Design a protein around this ligand. Structure first.
Ligand SMILES: O[C@@H]1[C@@H](O)[C@H](S[C@@H]2CO[C@@H](S[C@@H]3CO[C@@H](S[C@@H]4CO[C@@H](S[C@@H]5CO[C@@H](O)[C@H](O)[C@H]5O)[C@H](O)[C@H]4O)[C@H](O)[C@H]3O)[C@H](O)[C@H]2O)OC[C@H]1O
Length: 314
């Protein structure tokens, strides 16, 4: 393998990235996008704010640009995300009861129908659970609709798109803990009752030096419920600026995560949350943290690059 794309291809797995379609006009970004990945997800372009800015009025230009990019370069297209408490427009937050449920169902239906036959898998529901266990405590969906909204979203997604793989996605669920246990209970329940659900995403927003040692075991127990598993938003952030020690640890951490996936037969692959540190979400949310991705801010391969290639068995 001369690229991460080749390494993942050879491993029979996906290696993806989070795309900002506006950055496609930056040729270096596009070069790496084109050559290093076999899967793409919209970083923002297919979220509710980006697709339904007013009630039942849709803005698919940006999402279409992502879908077209995937089709033009022969990459799998992963959909993110139909139902999520964040990046939810004020008009939706202002609705209540059945009016709110209807806006959710309509959102799921229209977006899934629009991308049907293009998007292969959806994050139907994103970040439904709470650190420490149970349901998320600051969600419009949880508050207005209660426990049943997850099942409602999945069934609506399947009604719109009979064949797309329908995933639930979350973070801080990589290890076995109260959060991943709650997620596990739901997945088992849905499979038991025949609720449409095909996959589970593990965001893997990790901190350098802190990869859960039970990650493989956790992925395996989910896979054994009869669903596929995927690492969906991998980045491994550090205190900036980087140095040799931090970059070495980060490389080892990337290797650990990719190996965990390689060790689980139903782990579809790994998607990193961006290409270059230049554009990563991390520094804006975590002051003084960053350098979380595989390429630095000048597009140089970091040691993480070799680690990923090695982990895919290249
Ligand atoms: O106006 C919009 C504008 O909002 C966007 S900016 C956009 C914001 O969304 C991000 S994607 C981002 C990916 O991470 C997930 S999970 C995230 C993780 O961090 C937690 S703290 C957590 C605690 O425990 C630690 O050990 C663990 O490692 C930590 O991660 C945080 O609370 C949680 O939210 C996140 O939810 C999600 O927002 C995009 O990349 C940005 O671009 O741009 C478009 C504009 O129109």
């Amino acid at each position: 393998a001369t690229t991460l794309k080749e390494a993942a291809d050879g491993a029979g797995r996906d290696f993806g990235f989070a795309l900002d379609p506006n950055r496609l006009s930056e040729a270096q970004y596009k070069a790496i996008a084109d050559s290093e990945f076999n899967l793409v997800v919209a970083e923002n372009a297919m979220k509710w704010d980006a697709t339904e800015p007013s009630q039942n009025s849709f803005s698919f230009g940006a999402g279409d640009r992502v879908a077209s990019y995937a089709a033009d370069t022969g990459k799998e297209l992963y959909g993110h995300t139909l139902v999520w408490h964040s990046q939810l427009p004020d008009w939706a937050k202002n609705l209540n009861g059945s009016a709110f449920e209807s806006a959710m169902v309509n959102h799921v239906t229209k977006v899934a129908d629009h991308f049907e036959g293009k998007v292969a898998s959806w994050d139907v529901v994103n970040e439904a659970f709470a650190d420490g266990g149970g349901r998320r405590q600051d969600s419009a969906f949880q508050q207005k609709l209660g426990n049943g909204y997850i099942e409602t979203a999945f069934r609506a997604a399947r009604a719109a798109d009979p064949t797309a793989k329908l995933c639930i996605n979350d973070y801080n669920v990589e290890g076995i803990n109260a959060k991943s246990n709650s997620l596990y209970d739901l997945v088992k329940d849905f499979k038991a009752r025949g609720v449409p659900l095909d996959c589970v995403g593990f965001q893997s927003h990790l901190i350098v030096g802190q990869v859960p040692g039970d990650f493989r075991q956790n992925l395996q127990r989910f896979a054994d419920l009869g669903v596929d598993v995927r690492i969906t938003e991998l980045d491994i952030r550090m205190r900036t600026p980087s140095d040799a020690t931090k970059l070495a640890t980060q490389a080892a951490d990337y290797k650990k995560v990719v190996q965990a996936c390689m060790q689980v037969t139903r782990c579809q692959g790994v998607t990193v949350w961006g290409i270059t540190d230049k554009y990563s979400w991390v520094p804006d949310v975590f002051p003084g943290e960053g350098a979380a991705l595989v390429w630095d801010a000048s597009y140089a391969k970091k040691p993480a690059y070799a680690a990923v290639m090695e982990a895919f068995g290249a």
